[PDB]
């Protein structure tokens, strides 16, 4: 029979890119360092001090710059069925963003998103106070196709500002971006195609770095990192495990991720509403990405990173505004989703005990209504490579000496990332954890595991000092300690006892009845 007339719409982007100056700054996503002197240099310093981003430079980079091709070449082989893909509202909440970074985000979306797939770009002003975001912004956006600008009536925070955008959205799919992003070519089709296959998939781009000082684009074609967390409940990145890599049919297929970096993701609008959207009790910034990740997995969805979708993000030098609510937000997530495992969190971030977190009754009712699975399920099924501490009563906290009163084990690595190979010492107990937080485990190891990777105390061959190693699957012989009832700390391989010795360090000595060889755990100082 005769071919049917296809669905009408242009596959080309909503807007064409204007002509580029051949010598323009930052044109190919390269690093730019301007080497300024005098007053121009002071203006650059002031822009960094004011935005935590080199806005002096951003103001001199095109708002219409095309990112270089950086993805795996197999992504170019993908064919998409534009006639059947859903349409998306792109939602961009912003608070006091600079002019050039925000507008470059908008033009990037309009200049990379296929017209047939993009319903609208919704900007949500979260009660910004900067003047360039007022009448000047409305005037600049007023004529653009497929752009809406919505303004909050008071400071909402990113959660509730995003929900303002979602509430106004007209597309089938909600795609959230930050107000300082730049889209790789072809970023949108993979997300929409995946949601077209599975309504309950929340799908994230791989988030590439755009450097806040040079605006260099650092996307690459390798396997991306995926999202996890540690037991301080801070988001961390990790490498894709072998379990998940075996299940991928090609390198450019979607990858299941325990958690999301947050803020860049696509989701069916009906499914986002079905899952209870966002906890409206979270404030300002932080913690919502973890709560949303836990909710997605425990309540029956899938959270995935799509290797063919790349979005660059200007990670700032430091926090550009006060982020004092992340702890309370994380407590809301922990109290609703983590069950008994919230205690491992409270042990490693004791401030969380004191933090007011409001009323979570309605989120707990949401969890019951959706019949969600429990947190032990999430750990065993979604994130089994995360080590789960035991924190047995009497076996965690500060490791204090009986003889040398008020001194406890203390380990402070030079770099917080590289913890291996330095001596554990003794130090006046301060009760703040981190460097004085240890856990004695059922596998006889003394673990240093406020954050990951877990460190385990060891004694190298023929030495008397205590050195920080990494914990392994099977405890090596030089990491095994026996903590007896009376307090003796016996190193099995040396056949020696740990003794508080002269500053102060713990050293192996022959076992005696001395109190300087007696140790005990204390959770709190008083």
């Amino acid at each position: 029979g005769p071919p049917r007339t296809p669905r009408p719409g242009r596959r080309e982007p909503v807007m064409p890119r204007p002509p580029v100056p051949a010598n323009a700054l930052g044109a190919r996503g390269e690093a730019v360092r301007l080497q300024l002197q005098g007053e121009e240099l002071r203006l650059q310093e002031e822009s960094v001090r004011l935005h935590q981003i080199n806005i002096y430079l951003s103001d001199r980079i095109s708002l219409h710059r095309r990112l270089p091709e950086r993805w795996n070449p197999l992504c170019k082989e993908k064919k998409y069925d534009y006639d059947n893909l859903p349409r998306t509202s792109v939602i961009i909440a912003f608070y006091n963003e600079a002019w050039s970074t925000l507008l470059r985000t908008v033009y990037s979306v309009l200049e990379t998103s296929p017209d047939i797939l993009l319903e609208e770009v919704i900007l949500v002003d979260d009660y910004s106070d900067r003047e360039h975001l007022k009448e000047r912004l409305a005037n600049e956006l007023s004529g653009l196709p497929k752009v809406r600008l919505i303004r909050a009536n008071k400071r909402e925070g990113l959660v509730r500002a995003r929900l303002l955008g979602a509430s106004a959205a007209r597309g089938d799919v909600l795609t959230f971006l930050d107000c300082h992003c730049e889209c790789h070519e072809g970023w949108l089709e993979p997300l929409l195609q995946r949601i077209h296959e599975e309504e309950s998939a929340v799908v994230c781009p791989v988030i590439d770095v755009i450097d806040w000082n040079t605006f260099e684009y650092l996307g690459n074609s390798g396997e991306p990192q995926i999202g996890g967390f540690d037991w301080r409940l801070v988001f961390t990145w990790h490498t894709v495990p072998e379990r998940e890599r075996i299940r991928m049919q090609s390198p450019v297929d979607v990858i299941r991720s325990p958690t999301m970096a947050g803020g860049l993701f696509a989701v069916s609008k009906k499914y986002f509403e079905y899952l209870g959207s966002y906890d409206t009790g979270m404030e300002v910034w932080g913690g919502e990405n973890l709560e949303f990740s836990f909710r997605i997995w425990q309540c029956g969805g899938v959270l995935e990173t799509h290797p063919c979708s790349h979005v660059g993000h200007v990670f700032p030098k430091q926090a550009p505004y006060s982020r004092n609510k992340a702890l309370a937000n994380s407590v809301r997530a922990a109290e609703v989703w983590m069950d008994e495992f919230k205690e491992l969190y409270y042990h490693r971030n004791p401030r969380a005990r004191l933090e007011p977190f409001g009323d979570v009754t309605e989120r707990k009712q949401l969890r019951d209504k959706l019949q969600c699975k429990d947190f032990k399920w999430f750990l065993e099924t979604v994130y089994p490579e995360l080590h789960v501490p035991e924190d047995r009563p009497g076996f965690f906290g500060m490791l204090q000496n009986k003889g040398l009163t008020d001194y406890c084990f203390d380990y402070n690595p030079p770099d917080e990332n590289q913890i291996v190979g330095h001596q554990v010492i003794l130090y006046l107990c301060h009760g703040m954890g981190q460097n004085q937080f240890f856990e004695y485990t059922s596998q006889k190891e003394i673990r240093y595991n406020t954050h990951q990777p877990e460190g385990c105390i060891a004694v190298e061959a023929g030495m008397d000092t205590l050195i920080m190693h990494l914990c392994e699957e099977t405890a090596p012989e030089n990491q095994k300690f026996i903590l007896q009832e009376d307090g003796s700390l016996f190193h099995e391989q040396s056949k020696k006892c740990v003794q508080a010795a002269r500053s102060f360090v713990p050293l192996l000595r022959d076992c005696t009845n001395s109190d300087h060889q007696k140790w005990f755990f204390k959770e709190r100082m008083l």
């Binding site: 390798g222 988001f235 932080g286 990670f315 926090a319 982020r323 992340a326 402070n412 301060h430 981190q434």
Partner: peptide
């Protein structure tokens, strides 16, 4: 002595 930012990924991967 003694969560304010979203980490970037390392140059490694």
């Amino acid at each position: 002595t003694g969560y304010y930012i979203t980490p970037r990924t390392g140059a490694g991967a």
